[model samples]
Target: SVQKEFHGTIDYGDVTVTGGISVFDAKFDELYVYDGDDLGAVYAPEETRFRLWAPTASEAFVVLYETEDGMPVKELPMKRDVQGTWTLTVAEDCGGLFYTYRVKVGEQWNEAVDPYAKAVGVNGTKTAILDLRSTNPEGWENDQKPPLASPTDAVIYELHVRDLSIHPQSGIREKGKFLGLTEEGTRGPNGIPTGLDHITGLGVTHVQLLPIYDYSQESVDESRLDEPHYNWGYDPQNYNVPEGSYSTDPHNPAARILELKRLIQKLHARGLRVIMDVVYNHVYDGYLIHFTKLVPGYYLRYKADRTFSDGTFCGNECASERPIMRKYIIESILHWVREYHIDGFRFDLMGMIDIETMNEIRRRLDEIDPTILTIGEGWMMETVLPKELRANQDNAEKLPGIGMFNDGMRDAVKGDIFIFDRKGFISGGDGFEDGVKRGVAGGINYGGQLRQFAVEPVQSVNYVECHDNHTLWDKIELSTPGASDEERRAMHRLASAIVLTSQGIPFLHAGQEFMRTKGGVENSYKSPIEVNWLDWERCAAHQDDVSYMRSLIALRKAHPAFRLKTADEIRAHLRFEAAPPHTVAFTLRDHAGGDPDRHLYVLYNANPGALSLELPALGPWEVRFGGEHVLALEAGARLEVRGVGVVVLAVPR
Candidate 1:
């Protein structure tokens, strides 16, 4: 026999019988203890009880402590429940308490890390107790600053922190640590500075760092022969803590947080926003502690038959549908913004998470800062079917202000950049339709709202090669046979030029401009230090590609049409020409009403022979920037665009 307490106004059900009486009044803010219902624990004063399902464990005990080292260790024995759950409760301290569970099955005893551990060891080999609220970040407490730099004007630099500073030529005493990244330097090549200055000097307004949270190093099977140290840091074990390996002193966790903060402050002072690549898909326990010992079913997604979801291609994927799981993920993101002063988040494998949960997270973020940049790795084109890509857009439409990576445009242009078939077309257009789709109107199914969503080109982070794939140079060489070194070099420029000049947010893989090669190793995520380092000396070797890229970026900066406030304005002014199959032309009109006739025409030639394009009508257009041999923009001006080249025609105000 038990009493039930209901809060707020609602209808109440009661049992009635002959010669029996029942009460049915519902009261607001009512409290009850031990109501004997399956609601579990609710609002306990000294300690809140937590029950987790761990079916395989023969015995489990809760380990409670305040710090990783030099703290009192207390264990709370758990009871086996009908639902195969282990239950326990200890004193709660918001300030400094940390906890994990130890489970024993048969003769094997494993100290299992918490699936909901806010902070853990960087390598996942050990566990570290952390008080997230009290974590002190450098410069954040003292400095009062704006929310973030402008999103539209950002030149985003994507880099792996350890790889950048680990090289000997990175020119820092404390190499491969967070401190080394923020070291200041004088001006260097390409008009950018050598160290952190390279970021500020290159007009980079945003730096998207690879995952800095605690994660496991790349591991191998029983045979250690294939072991590698190329830790990409994607296998996250902790959500709220910074990676300890990035610290000069791994023993001091506080130092790691402070050093990372210093780097953020220095970048902020230089007007650069910092975006973190956050992983909330699958955690790295190698199917051990987090998966086996902890509450397995609660943390991860499972099929209808109760098997683990394989969307991440990892052994398990987190289930965002679970209330507690969703809360932990969102709370972790909020923690970064509130405590660390991070400007934005680039969510890795974002589509794997549920749409409703993601939208709620976005809503919470908007409440914190209306202009916070939110980008996601929603690899829509990677979906096996075209219908699946459409389904992605349908889901994404519910998220109004969020930005997605446009893989549709990337795939189309992939052939153009690879230079295997310059004539490859998508959406019934000719001469590199794949590359030109997002920039112009027509494409091989670019989706209904894509053009509208990506109006400011920057909304779509256009790229040929990124951290995951083979560098464009390698792709071209592998796909195109007997291609001369000079031709391959030329093709590299052509590919980059297409991405740079196109009307979108262009992304340069760390060393793409200098034709960075991964030595024909397509998936070099596990490559040694020598292969992954930037090889700064190559900057001088590929001077021509570097110069072309700089010139293209300058050209983009000069044209306001390339970066507009809204997509509707871009859609209204975009025009195209009826050219031969091997030729393509398009023009952009100034929709701002401030500068009429400020139009620019872009032409592409993929023909084996030079194509003589009759110049489009330009009132008084001046050549702003483009490739070789285009006659001046007068009436009957015959422009001879070189075979497999891109040209841009611009006019003055």
Candidate 2:
């Protein structure tokens, strides 16, 4: 045996001298922790440092390219340090460079774009190394989001970039591009407003664009930019960069960044906030993703049997429980808020993420700006993670300040979108009256038998139709096959009315006001423009329906009773009124911050025949809104509600 001592008197246990071993030959745990800094190409005026975390890789290299379609200019090998991160530094500045990583995993060499790339060239094949500050539009620093005191006060309008201006009648100069959103005074056929003009006219607080982040450009060819290529962009490729397809030049990385900022600025100029639809649950292809190629099997979750988790139903679910992965998610979201001046994020499939991660996101965002909105689809999916740990609607109580899409309100107001024949409470479906009442109260506990999930009213995002499922018009036509167009239009109005008047955030799908249809297609995610485009002809055809929806939105915005912030507030002031079969009625009594009216009564009759209802005499009430016409009623007068009609009466002080 032999004992050893270092220069500083560090002792080594006595042991047999084995082949003249040294301190450098000893085994120790590698330092693989991430320090929450820029991970990709960090360029300075003097030099540029390229860093990549590939602990499992035997070797890594940065392949630089002068052009997107050109050959590699140079391949620089990276040095692995004690921290398990590969790094290389160029003495000269490399700000205008395009590069990709060539990582040697085991025996195979894989090429991938930088996971933290702020900009990418065409098809996202090469990462662009440019100064992000140069991408900002003029007056970008002065840009401010519309004031949002509470999430419940928001009326969100969900629209796709291409669908908003792809139609021939769409008078947008830059159709299917971010520049199109900045065009003012654009109109559809018959001089009806379209694009930003139409969106602002509807009085919505936020315009939630669907997945504007960098997505799979392979699905659409860049050569044929004018050709119609439709996708909902759920297949995320690069998490940070804006989509190139939405830019005028897909080859220029800065073009997408600048145009997207311009779009946000123009929207803000109109006093509208922008809510980015983010898909962080899964990447487009797990094997080809930058995270997987650099650090295999570290960024995604796996089942007990060692298979990838499929909670997103998109092949792989992100392991948000992992520290590094969580950091990536938080950093990606903050980049949007800091860079794009985005006001909110509508998370896609939030249930796949852990509760701690979601809560941490809220905490961090609150530190930056409390008014920034965070909401998502909280439907539980089958994942490897424990069901109790999931962030679904059942566990909504654990997530404060994060809103979940109110599927209960959706199915109660409109029929179960999955089943074509099954009708809802407002659609003449039986035995959903209690469910409707629960939804009207913001899906919070009303001391009833109904199952509620939210602790506060703002937790529920009330809507009948969104980007998913059948349009409200198509659903009504499918469920009520024998009904006339007039009847279908009336049911549509009733559904919108219920959503707007519900005690939660109101959401409207784009073109839903004019009865937008996908030609009966349920999931039109990859459908062509013919099926997804907003048909302005429909807007012209249904001018009355559009007008009614505009008025309903105005009414909701004017009344505080419909936008109660807490469950306690709703319980104290809102109560369901007894009515006949196929009819629902609710009364909101005088409360602080409520309307000037002493009492407001809302009635919905879905029956086929007119029903006469007796009323309580609070005061002399007048009809402010009728389904077909406005009326004046005497005190304690018996009201005759038309079949399939809705009426709102107010008793003034």
Candidate 3:
């Protein structure tokens, strides 16, 4: 034992170690969990500091390029610092320049972009060193999100950027781009609301964009934008930057960020907050991702046999349990909130994430804005993590303030998502009443009866339609064999009505109101533009259904009872009322949450024909909605509700 370990860099001109890279060793993590804040290319006007965390690399060099595909400008060597972090200080402004890092481990060199790259050049081939101040659009600093009193008050409308604009008749000039979302006063087919106008007119509180992060070029090559390609953007390449394909000028790194900010500012001006759907569970290609390239065998989880532990059905799952992994995830989210002003986050495959990480995310967001929603696909899945640690619906109580997607309600209101032909409550599925009831109570253990998951109503995100799975229309079509188009429309309306009126956060798909279909495509993650794009012709075609859905959103917004805050409050004020076998009836009595109505009664009739149901014994019932479906209204004794539509009656104004 001649020598021992010491901290900080020293002068060792050519003393290179010859051994296997120990990135996966437990000791490696303990020794190399770099907590330094000065990672990435820290850009200053006069100078820039580039940092890379590669503990096992014997040598490291920062490479620079003038253009995306141009020749290298410099190969600057980096000083290895304590905690496995490598740093290089350049005494010049490096803005508009592209940079990558070359690290030598095990006698071989691997090159990758800085993992903390806030911006990247065209196609994200090289990380860009740009001033953050230049990326902001006008009025971005003063931009404020729409007021969200509670998570339950949100009516989330999910849409893809390209889906809203790519349609030929969309009338949006900046088609299939971030600026497409900012284009107002656009007319679609038959001169109806299109693109931004359609979103604003629909009356949604939050606009949940699906994965706007920088993605793999294989999805949409920025170099070949002339060709037709469509992606939902789940494949994340860079977490901090917006997708280059969505930008009109991907050649300019600043344009992508500026355009996205413009979109968010526009949405904010229209009183709609922006929710980023983040796919943190897995990267586009785990093997070749920047994280893995920079710190091999550390970012991804592996089994005992050294195989990848994939739970997302993607190639690999991220090891969020690691210290630096956790730090990077948290920092990236904070960057989005502070730099981009993202109002909320929807975690993709949240079950793959750990419980503690999710709680920390919610806690951090609470520090910023308590009302900023954090909901996700919290379905239980098999990954490397223990069941107790997974942030799934099973452990929802363990992770309070984090909303779980109510899949039980989704399947109950519509049908089995994975199974195409499985029927649900609307299509006369067996034993779906209790499922709907569970969702109607915000997935709470209401009255100590239903063994649900949510601790509070805010934890339950009620929805019949989202970007994933079959659309409400397509699902109904697949499940309901013989139902006519009109009947299917009624069932769709009934589903939306139930989702909106439920005691939780309400969510809707972009073209859901118009009964948008994907030509029966189940998973349109990589489907062509024709299958994924919002059909303006369909929007112009079904004018009444769109208005009906808009009214349903307004109905939820007007009634505080529908958007109750607490599970205790939901149990206190809301009570299920007896109705016909095919109807799910409930009442929010005693002016719940200071609702304008003293008592609001709703009858969700999924019955095929007219049903004469006994009403709650609240005197002087006035029909607030669905008057067209009411065949007869007799005081508070009995009412005849025809067909499959939600009928809401209020007792006392």
Candidate 4:
């Protein structure tokens, strides 16, 4: 028998290897063949180098074109290296060029855009080569992000680019495009503020834009550019490039790049940070994606039956646990932060990724900018990876400095969003008072009593609604069909009150302030513009509701008691007080770095009838928030909280 000895040289007939086994047969868990940097096009003053990893391919070529619709100018054959990377160096500068790779697999040649392209032509069919510095807006070097002292200080407002100014009443010159977000003083038909002005008016710390990266479903005819096409952009086509459909000129790669930077610069100028919603969990389609085309059966996870895993519920799940794939994920994240000047990221379906990758991302991002926030959806998704290794809420403690969307709080406040008719704590649902109390306490486990998954306050992202679900107003309306409009509005305010007062980062869906709706449609991911666009007219009609949300945001920002950074601080200062059925009460005692109030008492009455309660003391306990009224209270008065109302009192020191 032949033995595998020192240096591990093995022989099998004509096959001899110095290593124990080939990479294909290696028993090790991970294979980090690619470092992810310098693999794509690298341009210089004298020459440009292009590299790609295709271990199984026999031949490769870089086909360059002069124009988007023009014929190829030249086809340069690439040489394969020992590390399985194909490289081609052009002696002349390759700037202002369009290129794609053609790799021969078996007997057929296939073409694909560079997976690492920083910029691409229309619909991402061809990658563009240029100096990235030229895409910067004027004075872009001096742009500074809004200062975020702690993750708990973030008030994230989620919006889509096209949805912001698509309505006819938007009055934006460049409607449904990146330039629309830069319009300073745009207004709606009713004279109410629209676009950027409306966002700043709400006083949110960050605006979380839904996937702005290059994605599928952007294949619109150049002549029919005015026609509306809708998608949430979860189907990522190119991870680094901006979505051309959102640009005024999709044919010009520079236009998409520069316009996006202008929007960011304008947003930063107004002291508002931008958080990009990233979909690294899955690609739109496996065969059409660059990841699979470059290296088959490597970038995605598979089941025992050899079928692709669908943890994202979006077809193919990315293999984040693999070494090269993990490198790709981290590099892409850093690219956005460094190149685009983005302040934060919200990972979509983050549970599809592994805990180690999520932690590495947090570590690398912290090195670049400590204030750069990272948050994600943490629901457990069915995948091939073990539950213990997944980056779900159950494993949130493993990922410090990264926040998870608090579905516990989301359901407790507004009921189960998946089930339309189920009533929640704010909707007079029974047996949910304990859950609401736990959520209000920052979703931290306290004395083995508070049943929550988070270890600290900052780990919870308190929100009742986001882009994936129905609007808060619509949820209440659907659940309580017979309830009066006044009652429904109160319920909406009640949900908002819980989210704003909770000890965590508060997130609000765009247009939520004015009771935005989708005509009761549950999933509008591919819905037409008529259903998805923001109705500014609704903002004019429901100005009072908008005022209520604005007031809550201001109050949360002003008071440190509501933004506790840790679970220990919450346990020390926040105490849950006894209250009646269908009601929850808590008091934040005077502590270091807290408000000037000696004690701040918060009460929520969700019952249909008014509830009267005895007071602890008398004289000068002013009412900061009196349910829907927001009035001042008389001293030594008994508290009479109205149905579906919230009462907040501040006692002077």
TM-scores, one per candidate: 0.77, 0.93, 0.96, 0.93
Lowest lDDT 10-mer window, candidate 2? 1-10
Candidate 4 weakest lDDT stretch, 10 residues? 9-18
Give stretches of model 1 more than 4 Å off.
1-72, 76-99, 102-111, 114-138, 142-152, 186-193, 217-228, 289-292, 380-394, 416-431, 439-459, 580-583, 591-597, 605-609, 635-638, 643-645
Give the count of colliding residue pairs in each prediction: 5, 1, 0, 1
What are the lDDT figures for the candidates, one per model? 0.58, 0.82, 0.85, 0.82
Q: What's the ranking of the predictions by lDDT, best on top? A: 3, 2, 4, 1
Q: What is candidate 1's lDDT per residue for 1-653, written digit by digit as tens?
A: 01123232211111221012211112110211112222122223466554544544567876666565445467778776643456766556423444567776434455665554444433443344444434455446674443432344445667877666666565656666677778887333443445575545455456788888876644311123233345577776667678777776655545677788788877777777788888887776434535444443455665655555566776667766555566667777887888688888887887767666777787999898866677777644332122222223445655555666665555555454444434233212244553455544421123454343443433566667777766777776665576678666655666666666555466667777678887877666657878787655665466566667667667655665655444555567666665667556777776332333377777755444556677666556566566464544454565666555567776666
lDDT of 3: 0.85
- Write out the backbone clash pairs for model 4: 619-636
Error of 1 at 277 (Å): 1.5
Candidate with the larger TM-score of 1 and 3:
3
lDDT by residue (507-559, candidate 3, tens digit) is: 89989999999989988988999999999999999999899988998888888
Candidate 3's C-alpha runs over 4 A off are: 1-21
- Displacement of residue 534 (Cα, Å) in model 4 is 0.9
Q: Highest TM-score among the candidates is held by which one?
A: 3
Give me the runs in candidate 2 sitting further than 4 Å from their true place: 1-31, 627-632
TM-score of 4: 0.93
